[PDB]
Amino acid sequence: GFKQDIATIRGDLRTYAQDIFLAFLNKYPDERRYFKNYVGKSDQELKSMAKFGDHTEKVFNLMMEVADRATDCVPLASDANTLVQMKQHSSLTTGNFEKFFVALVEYMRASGQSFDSQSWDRFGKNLVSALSSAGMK
């Protein structure tokens, strides 16, 4: 289930974080514009820029912390607030996060593994609702 998925992802956090982030950028290429240093790089090229692996790991670490603190896939309002307030997320709307979760859920469904993809889909929806509540446009 969802708790075990957190453990699976944590076990190989950098690999999952990179793969899922790449699935996101490749599904939604317009989103690459927010990451000016990643423009004009292939999958394998990004996997060699320091900030890429370190970025992705840090993002997914936070995501895992938010997922672990959630109850029944509902995130804490305090965690949504953090996400809205981050200077790095100042130009974002909920639609950016919707895209993120669509990519993540698609990745999990395509995986050979027994991810609880329905719970990640719900988590994402619940997080998007909490982001709006916390004032994200």
Ligand code: HEM
């Ligand atoms: C639940 C989803 C997300 C979480 C947990 C999250 C978390 C983070 C964290 C921790 C950082 C800081 C990384 C660091 O300084 O090393 C970061 C930076 C950033 N986030 Fe997110 N984020 C999420 C979704 C998004 C989405 C959907 C976008 C855009 C589509 C986005 C755009 C960025 C940008 C542009 C940066 C700055 C990258 C840089 O340092 O150049 N984030 N985010």
Ligand SMILES: Oc1c(Cl)cc(Cl)cc1Cl
């Ligand atoms: O920074 C991101 C990561 Cl590491 C993964 C995805 Cl799915 C999307 C975002 Cl914007």
